[PDB]
Design an enzyme around this catalytic site. Structure first.
Site, PDB file in Angstrom:
ATOM      1  N   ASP A 129       0.825  -1.210   0.000  1.00  0.00           N
ATOM      2  CA  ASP A 129       0.000   0.000   0.000  1.00  0.00           C
ATOM      3  C   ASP A 129       0.863   1.266   0.000  1.00  0.00           C
ATOM      4  O   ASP A 129       0.505   2.265  -0.635  1.00  0.00           O
ATOM      5  CB  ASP A 129      -0.923   0.029   1.233  1.00  0.00           C
TER       6      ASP A 129
ATOM      7  N   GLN B 244       6.635   7.985 -10.354  1.00  0.00           N
ATOM      8  CA  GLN B 244       5.984   9.037  -9.557  1.00  0.00           C
ATOM      9  C   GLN B 244       6.792   9.499  -8.350  1.00  0.00           C
ATOM     10  O   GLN B 244       6.461  10.551  -7.771  1.00  0.00           O
ATOM     11  CB  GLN B 244       4.629   8.543  -9.035  1.00  0.00           C
TER      12      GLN B 244
ATOM     13  N   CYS C 139      -2.434   0.767 -13.478  1.00  0.00           N
ATOM     14  CA  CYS C 139      -2.495   0.764 -12.016  1.00  0.00           C
ATOM     15  C   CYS C 139      -3.664   1.677 -11.645  1.00  0.00           C
ATOM     16  O   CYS C 139      -4.712   1.587 -12.289  1.00  0.00           O
ATOM     17  CB  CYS C 139      -1.135   1.139 -11.423  1.00  0.00           C
ATOM     18  N   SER C 140      -3.544   2.578 -10.658  1.00  0.00           N
ATOM     19  CA  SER C 140      -4.662   3.496 -10.453  1.00  0.00           C
ATOM     20  C   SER C 140      -4.614   4.686 -11.425  1.00  0.00           C
ATOM     21  O   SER C 140      -5.559   4.882 -12.190  1.00  0.00           O
ATOM     22  CB  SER C 140      -4.715   3.946  -8.988  1.00  0.00           C
ATOM     23  N   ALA C 141      -3.486   5.417 -11.485  1.00  0.00           N
ATOM     24  CA  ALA C 141      -3.348   6.526 -12.441  1.00  0.00           C
ATOM     25  C   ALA C 141      -2.720   6.123 -13.776  1.00  0.00           C
ATOM     26  O   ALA C 141      -2.860   6.869 -14.761  1.00  0.00           O
ATOM     27  CB  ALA C 141      -2.524   7.671 -11.825  1.00  0.00           C
ATOM     28  N   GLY C 142      -2.089   4.960 -13.839  1.00  0.00           N
ATOM     29  CA  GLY C 142      -1.420   4.506 -15.053  1.00  0.00           C
ATOM     30  C   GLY C 142      -0.096   5.194 -15.356  1.00  0.00           C
ATOM     31  O   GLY C 142       0.252   5.318 -16.546  1.00  0.00           O
ATOM     32  N   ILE C 143       0.630   5.663 -14.334  1.00  0.00           N
ATOM     33  CA  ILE C 143       1.939   6.314 -14.547  1.00  0.00           C
ATOM     34  C   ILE C 143       3.041   5.826 -13.612  1.00  0.00           C
ATOM     35  O   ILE C 143       4.222   5.837 -13.986  1.00  0.00           O
ATOM     36  CB  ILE C 143       1.809   7.861 -14.474  1.00  0.00           C
ATOM     37  N   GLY C 144       2.703   5.393 -12.393  1.00  0.00           N
ATOM     38  CA  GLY C 144       3.729   5.041 -11.425  1.00  0.00           C
ATOM     39  C   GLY C 144       4.208   3.602 -11.518  1.00  0.00           C
ATOM     40  O   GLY C 144       5.244   3.335 -12.152  1.00  0.00           O
ATOM     41  N   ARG C 145       3.485   2.670 -10.886  1.00  0.00           N
ATOM     42  CA  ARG C 145       3.791   1.245 -11.070  1.00  0.00           C
ATOM     43  C   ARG C 145       3.800   0.864 -12.551  1.00  0.00           C
ATOM     44  O   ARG C 145       4.653   0.071 -12.993  1.00  0.00           O
ATOM     45  CB  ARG C 145       2.777   0.369 -10.310  1.00  0.00           C
ATOM     46  N   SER C 146       2.840   1.392 -13.331  1.00  0.00           N
ATOM     47  CA  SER C 146       2.777   1.079 -14.770  1.00  0.00           C
ATOM     48  C   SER C 146       4.057   1.519 -15.474  1.00  0.00           C
ATOM     49  O   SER C 146       4.567   0.820 -16.366  1.00  0.00           O
ATOM     50  CB  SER C 146       1.568   1.759 -15.413  1.00  0.00           C
TER      51      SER C 146
END
Ligand SMILES: O=C(N[C@H]1[C@H](O)[C@@H]2O[C@H]1c1ccccc12)C1CCC1
Length: 284
Positions: A181, A262, A215-222
């Site tokens: 998390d 991010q 992912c949630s925003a599609g920029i960090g983990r993605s």
């Protein structure tokens, strides 16, 4: 500089935040006018994460062609990715329309539906074989075929049917279920094992449309997923693998979608993943 020793030099000097801010300063800025039209407000999860106009995926629809999704096309590596936000209640039909129209084989999900006690994306696939989903706004049917639950990730086989033509296709759902998390994983070993499973399935290969990753925003983990994959591929293709510059690859990817990676912790984790991954590829 090489990667592994540049890495130790940033650790010993504790300068990850400064390196990451340099990347933020040099990153491309392109218009995202379509994303900001008033009619698209409920198609965006976050007001500060938008696809650029020049690289956005268009839906094949004359009313409204907008989805929060970007095509990342890596020319030297010969890989393409679609990076998108976690689907919203009013965009699950658009999401599967994109998968269909772009001829994708695989979907890569790097978040849980609930994290930190809040919803991070819609429940956009069926959880039981006998309870299929119908998306009436885009005329698609989606059925769960099988599910394989492992300790760090789950793989699902799904059937997507275009109800207009009665054509069907098999889609693979790769769900990484153990990203914490807060922060990043302590070791990259399970993330790399997951990447290799996606590769082994064919979902990243040129005989299919681009993989859809979110992912949630599609920029960090993605961003971490596609950055690690492209860097490892370049290390295999080139005569001199130590010439691969992860900061330069990240800036190239940021020409196609804003904000990839991010935090400075995500940047360090990406270095760690590529470093460890390059040892397993060979030869070892
Ligand atoms: O073409 C499709 N469905 C058809 C619907 O009858 C309606 O006309 C088509 C369509 C496409 C996009 C929105 C709405 C519609 C499938 C191809 C992906 C979805």
């Amino acid at each position: 500089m090489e990667m592994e020793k540049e890495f130790e030099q940033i650790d010993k000097s504790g300068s990850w935040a400064a390196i990451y801010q340099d990347i933020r300063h040099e990153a491309s800025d392109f218009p995202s006018r379509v994303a900001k039209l008033p009619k698209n407000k409920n198609r965006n999860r976050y007001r500060d994460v938008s696809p650029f106009d020049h690289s956005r995926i268009k839906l094949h629809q004359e009313d409204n062609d907008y989805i929060n999704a970007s095509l990342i096309k890596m020319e030297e590596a010969q890989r393409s990715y679609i990076l998108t936000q976690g689907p919203l209640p009013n965009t699950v039909g658009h999401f599967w329309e994109m998968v269909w129209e772009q001829k994708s084989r695989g979907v890569v999900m790097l978040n849980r539906v609930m994290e930190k006690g809040s919803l991070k994306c819609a429940q956009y696939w069926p959880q039981k074989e006998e309870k299929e989903m119908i998306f009436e706004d885009t005329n698609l049917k989606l059925t769960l075929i099988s599910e394989d639950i492992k300790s760090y990730y789950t793989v699902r086989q799904l059937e997507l049917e275009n109800l207009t033509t009665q054509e069907t296709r098999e889609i693979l759902h790769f769900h990484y279920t153990t990203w914490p998390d807060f922060g990043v994983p302590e070791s990259p070993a399970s993330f790399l094992n997951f990447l290799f499973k996606v590769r082994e399935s064919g979902s990243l290969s040129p005989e299919h449309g681009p993989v859809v990753v979110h992912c949630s925003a599609g920029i960090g983990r993605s961003g971490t997923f596609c950055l690690a994959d492209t860097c490892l591929l370049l290390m295999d293709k080139r005569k001199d693998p130590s010439s691969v510059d992860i900061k330069k690859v990240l800036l190239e990817m940021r020409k196609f979608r804003m904000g990839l990676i991010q935090t400075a912790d995500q940047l360090r984790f990406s270095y760690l993943a590529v470093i460890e991954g390059a040892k397993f590829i060979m030869g070892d």
